[PDB]
Amino acid sequence: EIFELKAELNSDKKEKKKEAVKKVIASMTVGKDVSALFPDVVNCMQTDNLELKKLVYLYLMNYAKSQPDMAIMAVNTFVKDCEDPNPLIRALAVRTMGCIRVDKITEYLCEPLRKCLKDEDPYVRKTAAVCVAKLHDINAQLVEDQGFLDTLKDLISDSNPMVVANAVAALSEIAES
Amino acid sequence: SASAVYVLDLKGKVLICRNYRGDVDMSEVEHFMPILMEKEEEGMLSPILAHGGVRFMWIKHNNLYLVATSKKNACVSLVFSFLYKVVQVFSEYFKELEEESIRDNFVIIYELLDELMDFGYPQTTDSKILQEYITQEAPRPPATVTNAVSWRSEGIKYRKNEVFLDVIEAVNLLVSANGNVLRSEIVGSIKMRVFLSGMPELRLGLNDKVLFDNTGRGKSKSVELEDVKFHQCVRLSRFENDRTISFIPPDGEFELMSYRLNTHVKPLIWIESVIEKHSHSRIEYMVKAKSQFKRRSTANNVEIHIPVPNDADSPKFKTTVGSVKWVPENSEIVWSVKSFPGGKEYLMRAHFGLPSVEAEDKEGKPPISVKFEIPYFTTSGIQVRYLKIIEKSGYQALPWVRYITQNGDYQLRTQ
Amino acid sequence: GNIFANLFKGLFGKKEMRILMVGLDAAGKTTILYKLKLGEIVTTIPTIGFNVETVEYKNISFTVWDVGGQDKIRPLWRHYFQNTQGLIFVVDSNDRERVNEAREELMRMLAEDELRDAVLLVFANKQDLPNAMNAAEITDKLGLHSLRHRNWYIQATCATSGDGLYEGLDWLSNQLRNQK
Amino acid sequence: DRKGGSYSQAAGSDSAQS
Numbered sequence: 001e002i003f004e005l006k007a008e009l010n011s012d013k014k015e016k017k018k019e020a021v022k023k024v025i026a027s028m029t030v031g032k033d034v035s036a037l038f039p040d041v042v043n044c045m046q047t048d049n050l051e052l053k054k055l056v057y058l059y060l061m062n063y064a065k066s067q068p069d070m071a072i073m074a075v076n077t078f079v080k081d082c083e084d085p086n087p088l089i090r091a092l093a094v095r096t097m098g099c100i101r102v103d104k105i106t107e108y109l110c111e112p113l114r115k116c117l118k119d120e121d122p123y124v125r126k127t128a129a130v131c132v133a134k135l136h137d138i139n140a141q142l143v144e145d146q147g148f149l150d151t152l153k154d155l156i157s158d159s160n161p162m163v164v165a166n167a168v169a170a171l172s173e174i175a176e177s
Numbered sequence: 178s179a180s181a182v183y184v185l186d187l188k189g190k191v192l193i194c195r196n197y198r199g200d201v202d203m204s205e206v207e208h209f210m211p212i213l214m215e216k217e218e219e220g221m222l223s224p225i226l227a228h229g230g231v232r233f234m235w236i237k238h239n240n241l242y243l244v245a246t247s248k249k250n251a252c253v254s255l256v257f258s259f260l261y262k263v264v265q266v267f268s269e270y271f272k273e274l275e276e277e278s279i280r281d282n283f284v285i286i287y288e289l290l291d292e293l294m295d296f297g298y299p300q301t302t303d304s305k306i307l308q309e310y311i312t313q314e315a316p317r318p319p320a321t322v323t324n325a326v327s328w329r330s331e332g333i334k335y336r337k338n339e340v341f342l343d344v345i346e347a348v349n350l351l352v353s354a355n356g357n358v359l360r361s362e363i364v365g366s367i368k369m370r371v372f373l374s375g376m377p378e379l380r381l382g383l384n385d386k387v388l389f390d391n392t393g394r395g396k397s398k399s400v401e402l403e404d405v406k407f408h409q410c411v412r413l414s415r416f417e418n419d420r421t422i423s424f425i426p427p428d429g430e431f432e433l434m435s436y437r438l439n440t441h442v443k444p445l446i447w448i449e450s451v452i453e454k455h456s457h458s459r460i461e462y463m464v465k466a467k468s469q470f471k472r473r474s475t476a477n478n479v480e481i482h483i484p485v486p487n488d489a490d491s492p493k494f495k496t497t498v499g500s501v502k503w504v505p506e507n508s509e510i511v512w513s514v515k516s517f518p519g520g521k522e523y524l525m526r527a528h529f530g531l532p533s534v535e536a537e538d539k540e541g542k543p544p545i546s547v548k549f550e551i552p553y554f555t556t557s558g559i560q561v562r563y564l565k566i567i568e569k570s571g572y573q574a575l576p577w578v579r580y581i582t583q584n585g586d587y588q589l590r591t592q
Numbered sequence: 593g594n595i596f597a598n599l600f601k602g603l604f605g606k607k608e609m610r611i612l613m614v615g616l617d618a619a620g621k622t623t624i625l626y627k628l629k630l631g632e633i634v635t636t637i638p639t640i641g642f643n644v645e646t647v648e649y650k651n652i653s654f655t656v657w658d659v660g661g662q663d664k665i666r667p668l669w670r671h672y673f674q675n676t677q678g679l680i681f682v683v684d685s686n687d688r689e690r691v692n693e694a695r696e697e698l699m700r701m702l703a704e705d706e707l708r709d710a711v712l713l714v715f716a717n718k719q720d721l722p723n724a725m726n727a728a729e730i731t732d733k734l735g736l737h738s739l740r741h742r743n744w745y746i747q748a749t750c751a752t753s754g755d756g757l758y759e760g761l762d763w764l765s766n767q768l769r770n771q772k
Numbered sequence: 773d774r775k776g777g778s779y780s781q782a783a784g785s786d787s788a789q790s
């Protein structure tokens with residue numbers, strides 16, 4: 001079971017990797033403590049198919065506080081994914097970076113957040129605005145040091161009304177705390 | 178300000194959960210079921226629960242309760258709106274809302290939950306727009322979400338340009354047991370199924386009383402809608418300025434406007450019912466229905482629900498027109514009529530037995546509800562005047578609309 | 593059983609093979625991988641995590657998994673030891689103080705009972721400064737000849753130029769493949 | 773045909789109001 005799943009996930013066949021990811025997602029949703037296999041799924045993370053990348057990101061987010069030490073092997077992957085040409089991939093990476101409740105991981109995510117704050121894609125701008133608020137809620141001092149308040153203020157005075165509304169909501173949430 | 182959106186089941190098992198902020202532990206869902214059971218068993222059960230410092234505000238779905246945990250002073254209205262949007266999206270994507278699709282459509286369900294809301298703040302709620310970025314069977318997100326028009330995808334092309342409208346009437350009447358009507362409200366519903374090529378900017382025009390008064394024609398039949406709620410595509414500023422209903426219709430069927438005004442006219446159906454219930458011996462149901470509506474209109478599928486005794490058995494019905502059947506599941510006499518011409522008069526004489534032993538507790542008097550549905554009948558008299566379909570390319574639209582009159586909250590209080 | 597499909601696949605090339613990319617930080621590992629895959633000297637930030645890529649040459653998919661030289665990432669090299677067939681060691685001849693640390697790390701990684709079939713692959717990186725040693729002084733200092741049951745081969749590759757990469761690839765193919 | 777009233781074509785605007 002567990003050994004077979006680990007062997008399937010550590011294989012070079014994408015057809016088996018997708019099935020293993022689906023089984024791991026179902027086990028976690030079915031109520032199975034699958035946090036012990038977090039390091040095994042770490043290697044099978046950089047995948048071209050977006051179907052397995054989303055499941056891996058969701059598992060890491062759900063298995064981030066449980067195994068913060070094993071999450072140190074994803075900063076490079078997040079940095080690499082924060083520059084994908086597809087706006088959806090960048091937005092997903094930004095959302096996953098802010099969702100990871102790791103104290104030693106949010107410190108290194110300031111550079112990708114700063115890069116994506118001025119993203120031309122409105123979805124990327126909204127994702128960066130949400131990630132800034134998430135980081136500020138997780139660490140207000142880190143957000144203040146990164147100087148994201150000035151970027152958030154300029155977001156309201158720009159185009160993309162959805163992005164402007166998202167930035168306004170993030171600023172209100174930050175000021176609320 | 179929801180902390181974690183989760184989907185429960187009828188047995189207390191969480192079908193799916195999606196944390197949004199992570200400020201609430203995932204183990205608090207276990208106490209939600211005992212708390213709900215205690216509230217229901219004590220009469221204090223409410224959709225907004227509270228597990229100490231964490232509030233569990235959620236609604237009950239067809240098979241599971243969409244409970245969303247929250248800890249801070251989050252907007253309950255925002256949480257309810259997000260839950261309603263999620264339910265609508267699930268209905269649009271999945272034809273059924275049950276546990277059969279929760280355990281079978283998790284691959285797309287998780288992606289939809291992740292994309293819809295981030296950090297407790299939803300960003301996209303259009304099922305049609307969301308279907309172009311998240312599929313269960315991915316390209317870049319469509320520009321409609323990024324653009325201002327997030328409810329009409331550009332580039333839609335069709336062989337023909339036909340738009341079907343539906344002027345659905347809701348006749349709600351609250352008649353007291355004394356015979357007087359207390360709450361008599363009629364809520365209009367302009368539901369249109371727009372199917373055209375491109376992104377036309379519909380210019381809805383009706384014979385509104387306010388519009389007629391402003392134009393100077395406040396002397397003919399004008400609809401006086403007390404409350405008019407336009408859809409997201411309808412521009413609020415245009416309607417507020419000079420009653421200009423200009424909006425881009427969506428691709429599919431959607432509710433554009435929903436009028437809601439009181440009605441001061443006599444009921445379309447007058448029900449005269451009597452209860453000759455003997456003391457544990459027998460019962461009589463002298464129910465007479467008088468149709469006050471126009472004779473040119475026929476009420477298709479008339480269903481006047483008459484609540485009979487719960488313990489009544491061996492009943493006999495002596496009616497005039499229409500099939501009358503007693504359903505033990507509902508414990509009432511279903512006065513089912515297929516076609517009811519306007520001005521018709523149906524008389525019924527019920528007769529059922531009653532056990533000698535009296536019931537342990539009272540059962541109450543459920544109201545008598547009629548299910549009349551007369552199509553091609555506009556009780557409010559509101560008629561569509563024009564529909565300005567304008568397209569940059571230029572095409573000849575063929576709009577269509579139908580008027581349907583039915584019974585809404587048309588309940589009759591029992592004596 | 594029938595092996596006709598395997599023979600047909602091997603008639604035009606079937607073996608792919610694997611490879612590893614380990615070494616100290618700022619040792620040309622990321623630049624070397626970029627040159628092998630793309631063919632240009634790409635400047636990249638220090639490898640906080642890891643980089644996985646593949647190289648198609650001689651009908652063999654030479655998959656290279658770059659590993660950073662971070663202190664917190666040094667003990668993470670054991671994760672790549674599972675399902676690993678090759679290993680490439682990148683030395684840092686421009687860091688005299690880091691040479692001892694690199695040698696100690698290589699000795700620690702070479703003292704694993706699970707990593708036994710991985711042949712030695714010493715790459716002389718940063719072969720552009722006059723302070724860089726030859727292909728024998730570094731090997732003599734590291735004692736590559738003292739690795740019993742280990743096939744070690746030292747190759748000097750210039751990060752800016754790229755010379756010697758073809759020779760190293762040919763040597764790796766000859767060590768991995770034992771056919772015509 | 774269709775239950776609930778046959779669909780009727782709608783106009784373009786108030787032609788009598790210019």
Ligand SMILES: Nc1nc2c(ncn2[C@@H]2O[C@H](COP(=O)(O)OP(=O)(O)OP(=O)(O)O)[C@@H](O)[C@H]2O)c(=O)[nH]1
Pocket residue numbers: 616617618619620621622623624634635636637638639640658659660661662717718719720750751752753
């Ligand atoms: N100019 C120059 N620099 C070189 C050369 N060879 C190696 N370097 C240095 O080596 C570094 C290589 O770093 P990367 O290619 O990004 O990857 P890496 O070698 O694994 O370093 P880390 O990511 O920190 O582990 C560069 O930053 C260079 O400063 C070379 O031939 N010319």
Ligand SMILES: [Mg+2]
Pocket residue numbers: 620621622623636638639658659660
């Ligand atoms: Mg590198």
